[PDB]
Model the fold of this input.
Amino acid sequence: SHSIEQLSINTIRTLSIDAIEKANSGHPGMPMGAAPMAYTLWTQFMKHNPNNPTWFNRDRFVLSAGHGSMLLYSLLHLSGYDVTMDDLKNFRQWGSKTPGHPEYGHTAGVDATTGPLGQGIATAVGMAMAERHLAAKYNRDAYNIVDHYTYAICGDGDLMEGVSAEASSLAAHLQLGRLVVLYDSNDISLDGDLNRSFSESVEDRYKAYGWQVIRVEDGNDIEAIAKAIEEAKADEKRPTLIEVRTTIGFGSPNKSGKSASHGSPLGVEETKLTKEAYAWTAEQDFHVAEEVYENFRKTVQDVGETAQAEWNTMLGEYAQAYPELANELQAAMNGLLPEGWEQNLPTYELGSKAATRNSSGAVINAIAESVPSFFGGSADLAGSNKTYMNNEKDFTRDDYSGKNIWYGVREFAMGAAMNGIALHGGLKTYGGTFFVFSDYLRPAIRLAALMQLPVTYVFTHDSIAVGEDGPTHEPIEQLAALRAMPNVSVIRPADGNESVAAWRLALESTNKPTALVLTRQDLPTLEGAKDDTYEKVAKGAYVVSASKKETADVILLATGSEVSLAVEAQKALAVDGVDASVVSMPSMDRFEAQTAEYKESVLPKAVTKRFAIEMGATFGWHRYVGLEGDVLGIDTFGASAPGEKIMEEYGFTVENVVRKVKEML
Amino acid sequence: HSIEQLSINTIRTLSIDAIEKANSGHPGMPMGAAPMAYTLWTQFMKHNPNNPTWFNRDRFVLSAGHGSMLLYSLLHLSGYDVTMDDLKNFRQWGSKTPGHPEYGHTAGVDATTGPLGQGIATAVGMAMAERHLAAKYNRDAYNIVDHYTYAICGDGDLMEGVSAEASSLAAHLQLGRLVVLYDSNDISLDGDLNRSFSESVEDRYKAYGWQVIRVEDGNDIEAIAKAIEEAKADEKRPTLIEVRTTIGFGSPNKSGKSASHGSPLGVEETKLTKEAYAWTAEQDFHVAEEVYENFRKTVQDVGETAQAEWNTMLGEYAQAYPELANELQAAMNGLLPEGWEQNLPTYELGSKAATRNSSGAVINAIAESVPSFFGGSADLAGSNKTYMNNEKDFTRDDYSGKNIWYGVREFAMGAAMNGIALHGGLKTYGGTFFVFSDYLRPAIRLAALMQLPVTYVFTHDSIAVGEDGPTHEPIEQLAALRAMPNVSVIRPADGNESVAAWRLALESTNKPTALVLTRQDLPTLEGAKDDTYEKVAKGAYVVSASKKETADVILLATGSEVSLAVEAQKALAVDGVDASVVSMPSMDRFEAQTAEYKESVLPKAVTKRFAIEMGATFGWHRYVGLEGDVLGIDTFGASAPGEKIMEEYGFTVENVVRKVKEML
Ligand SMILES: Cc1ncc(C[n+]2csc(CCOP(=O)(O)OP(=O)(O)O)c2C)c(N)n1
Ligand SMILES: Cc1ncc(C[n+]2csc(CCOP(=O)(O)OP(=O)(O)O)c2C)c(N)n1
Ligand SMILES: [Mg+2]
Done:
């Protein structure tokens, strides 16, 4: 065809190919197969403004098949987003705006970081949830202030991953009809023909969840794809999967339809044969005709600027009609917590006892009253995790204004949805499960950390104290596994007051996820934690119980439920003439950020007798106790028995702490 | 009423009484599932309570692990080594009846469960092993390996992504000997299933390619028996039998409510329930002799007979195929063939190899010399170098193939590997990029807990991966596994270390081994060349000695950073600093050595210690102490040629030297 549409589509293909050739690295097959569908979505259906890529009401887009990144970068560049030709010529290079997989925060117009398969779809589900929640909270009368779609492109690999199955079940249950996923269905995986590992009916599975499924038989037919997208948008009650049958590496005589086109450059000669197949006559690489830029200018820039202008005008009128509502929305879009929200938070008195899951619950209910942007839930453990907002309604297909989310037994989808909710903007979000099952959502926590998303995890039942449910349900290594990960704050509060401070720090976060590690069992309120708690916990470690002498005989370090044990041990040590300091370390990461002077004041370099106590793996503790110190931890799995019995047998008693401290002196 | 109904109500009352006594546990599912489970156990399953490890028994996985009293009741009543006193010690310290089923702890328990989703996926792995072994060993009418794999699961299992992955895989492989009974009761832990779950499970399973059979009344054992018969008759598709039950059936006030899921019924409710069953036994934990006799006839005698017939056939088979039979006997016992290691490669000085490639060379050497080897990759065979080039693919058309194509299903691969190892007869491995070890982490955890000697081939271990960028570059993955109890983590420094590491992985009997391997070529190290197996077996060793008996500094490194450390040693010597270099391929193996050995490697008198590893610094202070330092990476990576990232992140001789001098 000689149409401008076909030329634009082939420009996307050749730009992707040429950038991959020049990098000598990347994935050309999918941009070649998927260019027509993506072009159709991008220029004929999506509402977006290249000049304002963070427009709050733009249609969102997730490239779940992140390896196809050049498809996205081509579209951004061609459309007038701030991705330049020189940027494309630096694909996969040090410090470029065009990294091998899409990275939120590094490239204008990229809505989510993808690459790990499956998560893109689950993240988009979260964005769609956020859109409906915000629309229900803020829209009034004729002011459809929040009103947009959520689009994704995925491939076969995405649909094999369990996290996409979870997310797709959840999305159908919530009737998220503004979620539309285009599935690049090309019968090919990295290792070879898809039929060597996969033969299910994706269409029937999705209908079984409750999705609308539309098939496009010829992926090069943009009229068919446009009809499908129009059909998807007219269905209001079901999320839609459009299965678009394409040829991977379309155009390549020798690589099309083969896994060879998936994951490395076509090569010099194959590239020429491919351009020949496209009737692409340009002799120079990275060629774009001005009329292609003009095509995108009319269909994307002009349309998106008009849409944004009309939205801005409406927002002005909305703000006149509903000043307080509009003001709350502006604050939420900007991630601002209401002045004084924290004055609402609880305080635990001396001589009181409370599990930190319960103080966490009390805090969640205090936040729900004072922070209108709060939105979250649990993976089918609301009662156990204590995450429920008792004065709020449930988020359901029938009431999107409800704040309580029922994720079901879907930890990984929850973790990814939370990222989508945070990416959308407007909401402060959290999700709960047992700490032991944090492992189920680990890859999504890793994406939150990389994307710098201030989500909050409520991880309860943090130790062998869990008791009867046994070793499959008792965390051991989970703390270390999170503490080692870049850009994740891990806070394990020692009592009710430390937990209030920990939640405060989680809610105030702007650039990193925060994992709150909480007990099933009641903890006593600590005298040393009671005053100035927020400032103490903010330091990460502090002296919870001072020694009598300026220079201690020994320093006891402990976290969470072990701080009370360490304090009891300090008392018993003092009877025997050993003068111990006790340090509560609710957060190693926050402590490490403190000044050398502060750290020296808590852990003086002159005191080398140091004993750490924590019901979790010993891994990582020698950073603080050193070669001459010691650690009472747990480096085996747990047991099935009443929790107090296990704790006793595993050595978490005053008598045992005292003995081990003396052996070390 | 019938002896069947009596036996069933006995299962129900024993479960309730044991949970009452423990004041802990989940009674609802035992109550609802007792009839279906009784039917399976006594009418279809072939098993010998007297010999619970019989190699050709039908395997059983209670995927809904919280219903554990259901299993303990059946085991006890059937004559397995689970006593009445054991039942009376449900959930107590040291008992044989822990809150969730624990393989290796309790006679007759085939798999540890509790983490939802994984039971089903583990069962898929057991089914794969059964067909692979059948294809390899059966000849003519000697069906030596010929049994079923059954599981019971609930709604929670079927919401988890891992069960979805595993079911897609099981249908693709046409595992018709896998039969899953789905206790479908409309309730999850937090209340009505319809608060979070409304999909058609039956239609989803049909879409995968499973046979699906509905039983409308979970109390109708004749209908349940018909469904299982129909399941067994269908040889090409795995079967899901959706059994519609009432959770906590029999309880006037808790039946059909989440209230019966996870707490004891309570004293008063237990009476009302027992009244509902027309159960008139005045004493707790009561079993009529006629119930024991029912199980003796339908389970013990049947299973004894089946095992004896199997023994007879095995003997006859061995006369016709002595080599095969000897091989099977050794494999069932986890024995590796005498001299199998003579076959392994050796890397000469002056040669270069990526450790993924040396791993692939070893994989192909093992395939030749160890007949029990069986494994694959999660759609990364080409990149992980896991493929056995002289072997066929494991498919629906040829179960004898050794190369498994797991597809993009890391978690199900991990759980399937556990099932393969549980079955017995096979040494198994699975590969993916190390960065995606995170996707199968909960299955690694169950391998460690169950003590299964599976092997993970984790390639592309660091920022050296390069252009694919930070989502594909491991940072914290080493620490995250090193911290886990009972997991061996080995990061070989060159081709020879990798050969030794594979040998240690294959020889394992009681813990999983993670092999951490490079995309990029590494040089062969002089100090690793001789006695490599014994050196790597120690976990850490001096790869390049200092000149003096007491070094000025110790450089510690692992994997790809050992060559850098040796280079740095050379540079330091020129400036009058005498360094010792220690290669630490495995922290866990070093930790297991004597204090005497450790002192020989990291003498306490040398406190100037500097560790180098392209990963998180977390954990290194165990070795470098408060006075030492570490050059690691505590941020995410970047998209660029791998050598550029390595330079920018400070992994150069010049920077190592600079920093070492700084702490002197
Ligand atoms: C969780 C995860 N596992 C494995 C991979 C490696 N990987 C990237 S693409 C792919 C298979 C190709 O998927 P598909 O989208 O079907 O390929 P296409 O036809 O789109 O090129 C694999 C195994 C990954 N990126 N993420
Ligand atoms: C991975 C994981 N997440 C969460 C849990 C906690 N949990 C156990 S059962 C359950 C609800 C599942 O209900 P189902 O298995 O259908 O119970 P039934 O009605 O069969 O008793 C939850 C959230 C778990 N065991 N594993
Ligand atoms: Mg594909």
Summary: Residues A 380-381, 409, 437, 440; B 28-29, 64, 66, 114-116, 154-157, 183, 185, 187-189, 247, 261 surround thiamine diphosphate (ligand 2) (CB under 6 Å). The two ends of chain B are 86 Å apart (CA to CA). Chain B touches chain A through 109 residues (CB under 8 Å).
